[PDB]
Amino acid sequence: ILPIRFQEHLQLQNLGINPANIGFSTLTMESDKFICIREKVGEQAQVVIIDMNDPSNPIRRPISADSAIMNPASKVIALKAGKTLQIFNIEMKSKMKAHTMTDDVTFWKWISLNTVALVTDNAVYHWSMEGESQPVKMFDRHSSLAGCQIINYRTDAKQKWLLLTGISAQQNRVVGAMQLYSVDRKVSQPIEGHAASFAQFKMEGNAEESTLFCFAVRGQAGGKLHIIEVGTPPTGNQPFPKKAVDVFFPPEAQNDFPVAMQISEKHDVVFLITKYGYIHLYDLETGTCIYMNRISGETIFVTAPHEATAGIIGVNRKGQVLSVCVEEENIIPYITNVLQNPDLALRMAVRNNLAGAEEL
Amino acid sequence: ETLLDLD
Amino acid sequence: ETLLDLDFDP
């Protein structure tokens, strides 16, 4: 028995996608609802839109854009060409917004159902789709990210804690540089890290939820995962005890590094995926490592939360669309019998109302 | 300028 | 000032 379930959803090459376009600059997956791929047939650039609830019928439309990102929940698409940004409601066949920047945008994404984040060489902006909103500057970039490839931007639920992540080669290894910004304090902190996420977590005995920041890193001296509360705890709350635990890289994977993290608030577990296709599962409360294995031979370059299972969905270099989630009927007996950790098994059973700790 | 052709 | 104390010495 395994504590996780693997599932193949699609092979993109079977939907007519050219394998040269399956990669970070041309394929976007902003949620589990859609995948968008930019392709060029002759001199005509186009976008292919795959509805994940009807994937055998993809739509190809002509474009003149260098990047395209679909809204997480709706057929509303953002396109850009250098400094020109445009937003379309596809079913309405209408241009809902247009804005001209004064810098090129090196990375962008949807950070909520209604707000786009825009990263330039110098700063980070938020752009709300509500009313007549224009972009607002959130913070200036820190010099520690100068010259990095920007690979992600994330926030907490309330958009008060903001995190930008870049990577580069230093001393023949892939080095991660993050910038954590506090909206209320107006202060940045540089942190060495590769992949991260925020989470809401309600501790035993507390009336309010805690806001947690979890980040993984491969440093000079090996891999580490950190779980720490950000900000002042709500009035009356016990503070969350911070944890730091090892992240294992085998001796044969000298160049591998963390590329993605999703946290399940249903199960309170952390899913961590590496560049070269290794999955790790950790308990969010204690930081205990539950499981590790290689699940892809091809590299993984994009992920999102998988809503149906509360897991993680991803796309590899070949075009396999794959997901991993907690196997609810096996996780408790696995932790008891394979990990031989009855303490964790009992906790996770009662905490998330799972079966299998009746016998320990 | 129009970045997507819907017609 | 720093945002997070990332020395995990108790």
Numbering used by the authors:
A (entry chain A): 4 to 363
B (entry chain E): 1 to 7
C (entry chain G): 1 to 10
Task: List sentences quoted exactly from the publication behind this structure.
Clathrin mediates vesicular transport between post‐Golgi membranes in eukaryotes and is targeted to specific membranes by interactions with clathrin adaptor proteins. A total of 3 consensus clathrin‐binding peptide sequences have been identified and structural studies show that each binds distinct sites on the clathrin heavy chain N‐terminal domain (NTD). We have solved high‐resolution structures of NTD bound to peptide motifs from the cellular clathrin adaptors β2 adaptin and amphiphysin plus a putative viral clathrin adaptor, hepatitis D virus large antigen (HDAg‐L). Surprisingly, with each peptide we observe simultaneous peptide binding at multiple sites on NTD and viral peptides binding to the same sites as cellular peptides.
In all the structures presented a peptide could be observed at the “clathrin box”, lying between blades 1 and 2 of the NTD β‐propeller fold (“clathrin box”). For the cellular peptides (AP2CBMpep, AmphCBMpep and Amph4T1pep) the binding is similar to that previously described, with the 3 leucine side chains of the CBM LΦxΦ[DE] consensus sequence occupying the hydrophobic pocket formed at the groove between the 2 blades. Most notably, the directionality of the peptide chain is reversed. The first 2 leucine residues of each CBM (LΦxΦ[DE]) bind in a hydrophobic cavity lined by the side chains of NTD residues W164, L183, S185, R188, V190, I194, F216, I231 and V233 plus the peptide backbones of Y184 and S191. However, unlike at the arrestin box, residues that form the molecular interactions at the Royle box do not correspond to those conserved in the LΦxΦ[DE] consensus CBM sequence and we note that several peptides containing a CBM sequence (AP2CBMpep, AmphCBMpep and AmphCBMlongpep) do not bind at the Royle box.
